[PDB]
Amino acid sequence: MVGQIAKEMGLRAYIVGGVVRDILLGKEVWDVDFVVEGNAIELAKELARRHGVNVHPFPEFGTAHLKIGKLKLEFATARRETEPASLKEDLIRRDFTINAMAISVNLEDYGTLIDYFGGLRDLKDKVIRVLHPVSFIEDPVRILRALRFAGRLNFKLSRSTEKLLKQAVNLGLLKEAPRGRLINEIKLALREDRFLEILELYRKYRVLEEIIEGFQWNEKVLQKLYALRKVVDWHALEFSEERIDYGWLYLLILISNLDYERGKHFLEEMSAPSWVRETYKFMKFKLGSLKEELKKAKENYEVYRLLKPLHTSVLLLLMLEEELKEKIKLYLEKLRKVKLPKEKIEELKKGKELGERIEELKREIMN
RNA sequence: GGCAGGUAGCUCAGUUGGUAGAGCACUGGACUGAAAAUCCAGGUGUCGGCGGUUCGAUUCCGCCCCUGCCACC
């Protein structure tokens, strides 16, 4: 119906940006971005009125947000910067060729893909390419972004793009960039399932040393990241109903050997989840003594005592130890399974004495 | 899309999971020609909603509701 409204107003609207990419990648998304030649606000308001849904106009940005069902729609007016602007002018300010395409929702040309810069070819050849060599200089954050994209889609940077990226990092433009944008981009990165590869690309071009203070790369951390890779694989395989955010664990591994001050400050800027901060603060000190206690663990009940109060993240951190791996495994799918019948429980009750008694019964069952 | 706040009618605290609170409106009676003040007391509440784990969830976790702000595709 968007093309109908675009016809009545005599305008031109286009599905734009990564959405189009995700459409060509066979990925369905509930968030759609539009570029409209002429006023986008009136189009969004009319569309929202015809569907009888609340509209959220933003005149200063020239954009409007409206939610239809699960679909989150954002209409934007064509602009030549971050005179009327043609679609091509709006597409030329974008970062990568694969993000620079558009599809027309206008009724006559409906279904046609509009590619000016040959982004379709770069999507075909799995190439991450900038439109202009001045790209990274304008928006330094894109440095991460490209890598992140190169992480997710498993594509490869163009030689021009790569040289421009290396030259961009060498000038230290990553430091001059706003902290919030960078941190946000990293937060976007750690949510990917391929985020490990993104970390590999981060290590190759050494972008993490610039953002984080006092951070350096070594082999132990990397092998720890692959061990964590295997652990994450198995845990997300069998226990998948219990799944949590895995990226923050990698982030903890990277900052493990780093100073505690810069670590807490980093978690402060990144706005890490509570359990992440807790896992880190427990890792910096208590983890050593904990592991040493797990080494002294003989009976299953002492293991139960030294494990159960801890979160899942701590356990996954303990799975890095080869000696403790089969023990934690024994703890997960075996060491905790239990229930009790009626009569017996009723006899157990004949405050805290009840719970302690229960613990005594469990330690009686285990060993 | 991520991070705080959600506790009475309003303004607000509360973590090793273990049987909840302040200050003023609410009912009832002692008090009064009536009313209020004040006294005894006591509702001050499924501590957002729905499930899950647990002997037991305001707390652990998951999906969502609301409000405010930071961030922007």
Short mmCIF file of C-alpha atoms (C1' of nucleotides) in Angstrom, two decimals:
data_model
loop_
_atom_site.label_atom_id
_atom_site.label_comp_id
_atom_site.label_asym_id
_atom_site.label_seq_id
_atom_site.Cartn_x
_atom_site.Cartn_y
_atom_site.Cartn_z
CA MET A 1 0.00 0.00 0.00
CA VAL A 2 3.09 2.19 0.39
CA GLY A 3 3.42 2.43 -3.39
CA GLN A 4 -0.20 3.55 -3.62
CA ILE A 5 0.37 6.43 -1.19
CA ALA A 6 3.61 7.22 -3.02
CA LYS A 7 1.54 7.35 -6.21
CA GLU A 8 -1.15 9.63 -4.77
CA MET A 9 1.43 12.07 -3.42
CA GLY A 10 3.49 11.61 -6.57
CA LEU A 11 6.59 10.63 -4.61
CA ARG A 12 9.24 7.91 -4.77
CA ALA A 13 9.94 5.64 -1.80
CA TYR A 14 12.67 2.99 -1.53
CA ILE A 15 13.55 0.21 0.89
CA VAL A 16 17.11 1.13 1.73
CA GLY A 17 20.27 0.12 3.57
CA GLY A 18 21.28 -3.14 5.21
CA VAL A 19 17.66 -4.26 5.09
CA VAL A 20 18.03 -4.63 1.33
CA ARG A 21 21.26 -6.50 1.96
CA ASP A 22 19.46 -8.78 4.41
CA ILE A 23 16.74 -9.22 1.79
CA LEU A 24 19.37 -10.40 -0.68
CA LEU A 25 20.86 -12.58 2.05
CA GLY A 26 17.50 -14.29 2.51
CA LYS A 27 17.15 -12.80 5.99
CA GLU A 28 13.76 -11.56 7.19
CA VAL A 29 13.79 -8.52 9.47
CA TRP A 30 11.02 -6.68 11.31
CA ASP A 31 12.76 -3.32 10.93
CA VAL A 32 12.55 -1.52 7.59
CA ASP A 33 14.24 1.72 6.54
CA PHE A 34 12.86 3.90 3.74
CA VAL A 35 14.25 6.74 1.64
CA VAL A 36 11.65 9.07 0.13
CA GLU A 37 12.17 11.69 -2.56
CA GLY A 38 9.99 14.51 -1.31
CA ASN A 39 8.49 14.63 2.17
CA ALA A 40 8.77 11.33 4.06
CA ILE A 41 6.91 12.62 7.11
CA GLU A 42 3.58 13.04 5.29
CA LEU A 43 3.98 9.57 3.78
CA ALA A 44 4.61 7.98 7.18
CA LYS A 45 1.76 9.89 8.82
CA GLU A 46 -0.66 8.99 6.02
CA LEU A 47 0.43 5.35 6.17
CA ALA A 48 -0.01 5.36 9.94
CA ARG A 49 -3.45 6.97 9.65
CA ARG A 50 -4.70 4.53 7.01
CA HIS A 51 -3.57 1.64 9.21
CA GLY A 52 -4.84 3.51 12.26
CA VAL A 53 -1.59 3.27 14.21
CA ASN A 54 0.30 5.84 16.28
CA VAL A 55 2.90 7.86 14.37
CA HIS A 56 6.13 9.29 15.79
CA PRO A 57 7.23 12.34 13.73
CA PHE A 58 10.74 13.80 13.93
CA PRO A 59 10.85 17.06 11.89
CA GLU A 60 14.40 18.09 12.82
CA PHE A 61 15.77 14.74 11.65
CA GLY A 62 13.20 14.68 8.87
CA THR A 63 12.35 11.09 9.75
CA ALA A 64 9.30 9.33 11.19
CA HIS A 65 8.84 6.06 13.09
CA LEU A 66 5.70 3.92 13.08
CA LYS A 67 5.08 0.35 14.21
CA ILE A 68 2.70 -1.88 12.26
CA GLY A 69 2.31 -5.28 13.89
CA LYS A 70 5.77 -6.74 14.45
CA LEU A 71 7.10 -4.54 11.65
CA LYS A 72 9.03 -1.47 12.77
CA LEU A 73 8.97 1.11 9.98
CA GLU A 74 11.26 4.12 9.69
CA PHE A 75 10.68 6.64 6.90
CA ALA A 76 13.53 9.00 6.04
CA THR A 77 13.84 11.98 3.71
CA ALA A 78 16.59 11.83 1.09
CA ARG A 79 19.55 14.01 2.09
CA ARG A 80 23.02 14.61 0.65
CA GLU A 81 24.77 15.11 4.00
CA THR A 82 24.98 13.40 7.39
CA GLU A 83 18.19 21.64 -2.85
CA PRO A 84 16.28 18.34 -3.12
CA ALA A 85 18.41 15.20 -2.80
CA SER A 86 18.03 12.36 -5.30
CA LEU A 87 18.09 8.71 -4.20
CA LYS A 88 21.59 8.39 -5.65
CA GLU A 89 22.80 11.28 -3.48
CA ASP A 90 21.40 9.53 -0.40
CA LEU A 91 23.02 6.24 -1.40
CA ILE A 92 26.45 7.78 -1.98
CA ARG A 93 26.99 8.88 1.63
CA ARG A 94 26.68 5.29 2.85
CA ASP A 95 29.66 3.27 4.07
CA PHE A 96 29.86 0.00 2.14
CA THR A 97 28.75 -1.04 -1.35
CA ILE A 98 26.62 -3.88 0.02
CA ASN A 99 24.81 -1.32 2.19
CA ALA A 100 24.54 1.18 -0.67
CA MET A 101 21.76 -0.48 -2.68
CA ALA A 102 17.99 0.09 -2.69
CA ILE A 103 14.72 -1.50 -3.83
CA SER A 104 11.81 0.53 -5.21
CA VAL A 105 8.41 0.13 -3.53
CA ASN A 106 6.84 2.32 -6.21
CA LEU A 107 4.08 0.41 -8.00
CA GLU A 108 5.41 0.58 -11.58
CA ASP A 109 9.04 -0.44 -10.99
CA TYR A 110 8.12 -2.55 -7.94
CA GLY A 111 10.52 -5.43 -7.35
CA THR A 112 13.44 -3.79 -9.15
CA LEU A 113 16.81 -3.48 -7.43
CA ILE A 114 18.62 -0.17 -7.90
CA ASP A 115 22.40 -0.53 -7.70
CA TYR A 116 24.56 2.45 -8.66
CA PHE A 117 27.96 1.47 -7.28
CA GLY A 118 27.98 -2.22 -8.16
CA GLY A 119 27.22 -3.38 -4.63
CA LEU A 120 25.44 -6.39 -6.10
CA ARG A 121 28.74 -7.57 -7.59
CA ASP A 122 30.54 -7.04 -4.29
CA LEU A 123 27.80 -9.05 -2.59
CA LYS A 124 28.27 -11.71 -5.26
CA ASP A 125 32.06 -11.75 -4.91
CA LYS A 126 31.86 -11.44 -1.11
CA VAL A 127 33.66 -8.09 -1.11
CA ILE A 128 33.58 -5.33 1.50
CA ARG A 129 34.28 -2.10 -0.37
CA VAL A 130 34.06 1.59 0.48
CA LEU A 131 32.46 4.02 -1.97
CA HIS A 132 35.13 6.69 -1.61
CA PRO A 133 38.69 6.56 -0.18
CA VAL A 134 37.79 9.36 2.25
CA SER A 135 35.26 7.07 3.96
CA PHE A 136 37.13 5.98 7.10
CA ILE A 137 38.44 9.52 7.65
CA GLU A 138 34.88 10.88 7.86
CA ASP A 139 33.58 8.20 10.22
CA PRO A 140 36.42 6.36 12.05
CA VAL A 141 33.93 4.04 13.78
CA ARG A 142 33.30 2.37 10.40
CA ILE A 143 36.75 0.79 10.84
CA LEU A 144 35.24 -1.54 13.43
CA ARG A 145 32.00 -1.80 11.44
CA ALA A 146 33.64 -3.19 8.30
CA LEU A 147 35.53 -5.75 10.36
CA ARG A 148 32.32 -6.59 12.20
CA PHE A 149 30.54 -7.05 8.88
CA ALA A 150 33.53 -8.99 7.55
CA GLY A 151 33.08 -11.09 10.66
CA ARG A 152 29.40 -11.87 10.19
CA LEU A 153 29.05 -12.41 6.44
CA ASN A 154 32.52 -13.92 6.14
CA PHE A 155 33.43 -11.51 3.35
CA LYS A 156 36.81 -10.04 2.41
CA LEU A 157 37.99 -6.42 2.25
CA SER A 158 39.08 -4.87 -1.04
CA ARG A 159 42.78 -4.04 -1.39
CA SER A 160 41.88 -0.36 -1.60
CA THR A 161 39.57 -0.71 1.39
CA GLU A 162 42.21 -2.62 3.37
CA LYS A 163 45.00 -0.12 2.66
CA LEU A 164 42.65 2.75 3.52
CA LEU A 165 41.71 1.00 6.77
CA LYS A 166 45.32 0.37 7.79
CA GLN A 167 46.22 3.96 6.90
CA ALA A 168 43.23 5.12 8.94
CA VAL A 169 44.26 3.18 12.05
CA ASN A 170 47.92 4.20 11.63
CA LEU A 171 46.93 7.87 11.90
CA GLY A 172 45.13 7.08 15.15
CA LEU A 173 41.72 8.31 13.99
CA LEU A 174 40.18 5.66 16.23
CA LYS A 175 41.11 7.72 19.29
CA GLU A 176 39.64 10.99 17.97
CA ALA A 177 36.31 9.25 17.34
CA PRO A 178 33.54 9.67 19.96
CA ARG A 179 33.87 7.10 22.76
CA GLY A 180 30.15 6.33 22.80
CA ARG A 181 30.04 5.39 19.12
CA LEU A 182 33.04 3.07 19.43
CA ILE A 183 31.77 1.40 22.60
CA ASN A 184 28.34 0.99 20.99
CA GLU A 185 29.93 -0.57 17.92
CA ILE A 186 31.87 -3.05 20.06
CA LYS A 187 28.63 -3.86 21.86
CA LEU A 188 27.11 -4.52 18.43
CA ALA A 189 30.07 -6.77 17.64
CA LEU A 190 29.99 -8.98 20.74
CA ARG A 191 26.38 -9.98 20.03
CA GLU A 192 27.36 -11.79 16.83
CA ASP A 193 27.78 -15.57 16.78
CA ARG A 194 30.81 -15.14 14.52
CA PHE A 195 32.19 -12.51 16.93
CA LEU A 196 35.32 -14.64 17.41
CA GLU A 197 36.28 -13.97 13.78
CA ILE A 198 35.54 -10.30 14.41
CA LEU A 199 38.06 -10.51 17.25
CA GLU A 200 40.54 -12.11 14.85
CA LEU A 201 40.08 -9.16 12.49
CA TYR A 202 40.42 -6.88 15.52
CA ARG A 203 43.73 -8.56 16.32
CA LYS A 204 45.05 -8.44 12.75
CA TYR A 205 44.64 -4.68 12.38
CA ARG A 206 45.22 -4.13 16.11
CA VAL A 207 42.23 -1.82 16.66
CA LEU A 208 41.67 -2.93 20.27
CA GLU A 209 44.95 -1.45 21.53
CA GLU A 210 43.74 2.02 20.54
CA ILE A 211 40.30 1.91 22.16
CA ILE A 212 41.22 0.02 25.33
CA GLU A 213 44.00 1.37 27.54
CA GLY A 214 46.94 -0.87 28.42
CA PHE A 215 45.65 -3.73 26.29
CA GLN A 216 48.01 -6.03 24.40
CA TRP A 217 47.59 -9.30 22.49
CA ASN A 218 49.19 -12.65 23.32
CA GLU A 219 48.83 -16.35 22.49
CA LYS A 220 47.47 -17.54 25.85
CA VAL A 221 44.41 -15.30 25.58
CA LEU A 222 43.78 -16.54 22.03
CA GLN A 223 44.00 -20.22 22.96
CA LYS A 224 41.71 -19.32 25.85
CA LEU A 225 39.31 -17.84 23.29
CA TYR A 226 39.29 -21.06 21.27
CA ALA A 227 38.89 -23.15 24.41
CA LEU A 228 36.01 -20.82 25.29
CA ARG A 229 34.81 -21.39 21.72
CA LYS A 230 34.59 -25.15 22.28
CA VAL A 231 33.02 -24.67 25.73
CA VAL A 232 30.42 -22.29 24.29
CA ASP A 233 29.71 -24.78 21.50
CA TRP A 234 29.06 -27.69 23.88
CA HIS A 235 27.13 -25.61 26.42
CA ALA A 236 24.93 -24.10 23.71
CA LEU A 237 24.54 -27.62 22.32
CA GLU A 238 23.29 -29.68 25.27
CA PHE A 239 22.18 -27.02 27.76
CA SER A 240 20.78 -24.59 25.16
CA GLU A 241 17.59 -23.93 27.14
CA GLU A 242 19.90 -22.26 29.69
CA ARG A 243 21.64 -19.99 27.13
CA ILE A 244 23.10 -16.63 28.16
CA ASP A 245 25.14 -13.95 26.36
CA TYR A 246 28.41 -15.52 25.22
CA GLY A 247 30.19 -12.43 23.89
CA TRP A 248 30.65 -10.89 27.32
CA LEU A 249 32.61 -14.00 28.31
CA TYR A 250 35.09 -13.43 25.47
CA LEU A 251 35.21 -9.80 26.56
CA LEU A 252 36.11 -11.00 30.07
CA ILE A 253 38.84 -13.25 28.69
CA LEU A 254 40.35 -10.33 26.78
CA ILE A 255 40.40 -8.07 29.85
CA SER A 256 41.48 -10.87 32.21
CA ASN A 257 45.17 -9.94 32.44
CA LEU A 258 44.40 -6.22 32.27
CA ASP A 259 44.48 -3.93 35.31
CA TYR A 260 41.35 -3.91 37.48
CA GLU A 261 40.89 -0.13 37.26
CA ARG A 262 40.80 -0.01 33.45
CA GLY A 263 38.61 -3.11 33.58
CA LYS A 264 35.97 -1.62 35.86
CA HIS A 265 36.14 1.62 33.87
CA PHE A 266 35.68 -0.37 30.66
CA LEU A 267 32.66 -2.18 32.09
CA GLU A 268 31.42 1.22 33.22
CA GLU A 269 31.62 2.67 29.71
CA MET A 270 30.30 -0.47 28.04
CA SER A 271 27.42 -0.66 30.53
CA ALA A 272 27.93 -4.40 31.04
CA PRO A 273 25.15 -6.53 32.60
CA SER A 274 25.20 -7.10 36.37
CA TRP A 275 26.19 -10.78 36.14
CA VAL A 276 29.05 -9.79 33.84
CA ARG A 277 30.48 -7.33 36.36
CA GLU A 278 29.99 -9.90 39.11
CA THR A 279 31.70 -12.60 37.04
CA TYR A 280 34.62 -10.25 36.36
CA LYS A 281 35.04 -9.12 39.97
CA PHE A 282 34.91 -12.78 41.01
CA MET A 283 37.40 -13.72 38.29
CA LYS A 284 40.02 -11.12 39.22
CA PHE A 285 40.55 -12.48 42.74
CA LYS A 286 38.26 -15.24 44.02
CA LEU A 287 38.69 -17.38 40.88
CA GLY A 288 42.17 -18.57 41.83
CA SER A 289 41.22 -19.69 45.32
CA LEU A 290 38.05 -21.21 43.88
CA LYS A 291 40.01 -23.30 41.38
CA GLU A 292 42.46 -24.31 44.11
CA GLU A 293 39.46 -25.43 46.16
CA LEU A 294 38.10 -27.41 43.22
CA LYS A 295 41.49 -29.11 43.06
CA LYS A 296 41.02 -30.10 46.70
CA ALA A 297 37.48 -31.29 46.00
CA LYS A 298 37.02 -35.00 46.70
CA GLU A 299 33.38 -35.69 47.57
CA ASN A 300 30.58 -34.51 45.28
CA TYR A 301 28.98 -32.50 48.08
CA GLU A 302 31.95 -30.18 48.57
CA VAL A 303 31.84 -29.63 44.82
CA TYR A 304 28.13 -28.85 45.16
CA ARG A 305 28.94 -26.34 47.90
CA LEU A 306 31.71 -24.63 45.92
CA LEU A 307 29.67 -24.52 42.70
CA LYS A 308 25.91 -24.08 43.19
CA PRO A 309 25.99 -20.52 44.60
CA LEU A 310 27.96 -19.39 41.52
CA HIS A 311 26.38 -18.23 38.26
CA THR A 312 26.59 -20.07 34.92
CA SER A 313 29.26 -17.70 33.59
CA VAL A 314 31.64 -18.66 36.40
CA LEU A 315 31.09 -22.33 35.57
CA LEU A 316 31.81 -21.68 31.89
CA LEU A 317 34.99 -19.92 33.01
CA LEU A 318 35.85 -23.01 35.05
CA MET A 319 35.32 -25.18 31.97
CA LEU A 320 38.50 -23.65 30.53
CA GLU A 321 40.43 -25.85 32.96
CA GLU A 322 41.08 -29.30 31.48
CA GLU A 323 41.23 -30.83 34.96
CA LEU A 324 37.90 -29.28 35.96
CA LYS A 325 36.14 -29.80 32.62
CA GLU A 326 34.82 -33.33 33.21
CA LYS A 327 34.05 -32.34 36.81
CA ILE A 328 31.90 -29.37 35.78
CA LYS A 329 30.37 -31.59 33.11
CA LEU A 330 29.63 -34.12 35.85
CA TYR A 331 28.06 -31.26 37.79
CA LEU A 332 25.76 -30.12 34.99
CA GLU A 333 24.06 -33.14 33.43
CA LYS A 334 24.43 -35.45 36.44
CA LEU A 335 25.40 -34.11 39.88
CA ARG A 336 22.19 -32.12 40.11
CA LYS A 337 19.17 -34.30 39.47
CA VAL A 338 16.76 -34.94 42.34
CA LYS A 339 13.34 -34.89 43.99
CA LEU A 340 11.72 -36.43 47.08
CA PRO A 341 8.45 -38.29 47.77
CA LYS A 342 5.68 -37.08 50.09
CA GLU A 343 5.90 -39.25 53.22
CA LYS A 344 9.68 -38.91 53.52
CA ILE A 345 9.61 -35.11 53.14
CA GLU A 346 6.80 -34.93 55.70
CA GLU A 347 9.00 -36.97 58.04
CA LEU A 348 11.90 -34.56 57.44
CA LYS A 349 9.80 -31.74 58.87
CA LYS A 350 8.69 -34.04 61.70
CA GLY A 351 13.47 -22.79 60.08
CA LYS A 352 17.07 -23.18 58.93
CA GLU A 353 17.26 -26.63 60.53
CA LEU A 354 14.97 -27.95 57.79
CA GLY A 355 17.26 -26.71 55.02
CA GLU A 356 20.38 -27.95 56.79
CA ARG A 357 18.71 -31.34 57.24
CA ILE A 358 17.91 -31.38 53.52
CA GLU A 359 21.57 -30.65 52.80
CA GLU A 360 22.56 -33.54 55.08
CA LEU A 361 20.19 -35.85 53.21
CA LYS A 362 21.57 -34.75 49.85
CA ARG A 363 25.15 -35.22 51.03
CA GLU A 364 23.98 -38.62 52.27
CA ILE A 365 22.65 -39.46 48.80
CA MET A 366 25.66 -38.21 46.81
CA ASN A 367 28.49 -40.01 48.59
"C1'" G B 1 18.41 -1.88 19.88
"C1'" G B 2 21.34 -1.56 24.95
"C1'" C B 3 21.64 0.74 30.70
"C1'" A B 4 18.91 2.70 35.45
"C1'" G B 5 14.25 3.27 37.90
"C1'" G B 6 8.62 -0.16 39.07
"C1'" U B 7 7.18 -0.88 47.02
"C1'" A B 8 0.81 1.47 49.51
"C1'" G B 9 -3.87 6.58 47.37
"C1'" C B 10 1.10 10.01 46.85
"C1'" U B 11 6.30 10.91 47.97
"C1'" C B 12 10.61 6.80 49.19
"C1'" A B 13 14.46 2.82 51.68
"C1'" G B 14 15.00 -2.79 52.01
"C1'" U B 15 20.80 -8.61 48.87
"C1'" U B 16 24.44 -13.98 52.17
"C1'" G B 17 16.67 -16.89 49.03
"C1'" G B 18 13.73 -17.90 55.24
"C1'" U B 19 7.44 -15.57 57.15
"C1'" A B 20 8.16 -6.91 55.14
"C1'" G B 21 8.19 -0.86 56.47
"C1'" A B 22 8.04 5.44 57.33
"C1'" G B 23 5.24 10.19 56.92
"C1'" C B 24 -0.21 11.87 55.45
"C1'" A B 25 -5.55 9.97 53.05
"C1'" C B 26 -9.14 4.36 54.69
"C1'" U B 27 -12.66 1.79 57.74
"C1'" G B 28 -14.26 1.06 63.05
"C1'" G B 29 -14.94 2.50 68.08
"C1'" A B 30 -13.61 5.55 72.73
"C1'" C B 31 -14.33 11.24 72.08
"C1'" U B 32 -18.77 14.90 70.08
"C1'" G B 33 -25.17 18.70 69.56
"C1'" A B 34 -22.40 17.94 64.58
"C1'" A B 35 -17.48 18.06 62.78
"C1'" A B 36 -12.26 18.06 63.49
"C1'" A B 37 -8.02 17.40 66.28
"C1'" U B 38 -6.20 13.54 69.05
"C1'" C B 39 -5.92 8.19 71.43
"C1'" C B 40 -6.28 2.92 71.04
"C1'" A B 41 -5.38 0.29 67.35
"C1'" G B 42 -5.12 -1.87 63.03
"C1'" G B 43 -6.27 -2.52 55.62
"C1'" U B 44 -1.51 0.57 54.67
"C1'" G B 45 0.77 -4.55 49.77
"C1'" U B 46 -1.02 -11.09 44.84
"C1'" C B 47 6.64 -5.22 46.48
"C1'" G B 48 5.12 -4.63 37.15
"C1'" G B 49 2.76 -9.06 34.13
"C1'" C B 50 3.37 -14.26 32.61
"C1'" G B 51 6.40 -18.82 32.88
"C1'" G B 52 10.74 -21.52 34.33
"C1'" U B 53 14.67 -23.41 38.31
"C1'" U B 54 14.30 -24.37 43.48
"C1'" C B 55 11.24 -27.64 49.33
"C1'" G B 56 10.26 -22.17 48.74
"C1'" A B 57 11.37 -16.31 44.09
"C1'" U B 58 10.61 -8.81 45.38
"C1'" U B 59 16.12 -11.69 44.75
"C1'" C B 60 18.32 -16.48 39.89
"C1'" C B 61 17.18 -16.70 34.75
"C1'" G B 62 13.65 -16.06 30.21
"C1'" C B 63 9.74 -13.63 27.37
"C1'" C B 64 6.81 -9.00 27.72
"C1'" C B 65 4.13 -4.11 30.05
"C1'" C B 66 5.19 1.06 31.62
"C1'" U B 67 8.13 5.47 32.56
"C1'" G B 68 12.78 8.49 31.92
"C1'" C B 69 17.34 9.01 29.59
"C1'" C B 70 21.66 7.78 27.03
"C1'" A B 71 22.70 5.91 21.85
"C1'" C B 72 21.52 5.80 17.09
"C1'" C B 73 20.73 1.56 12.41
#
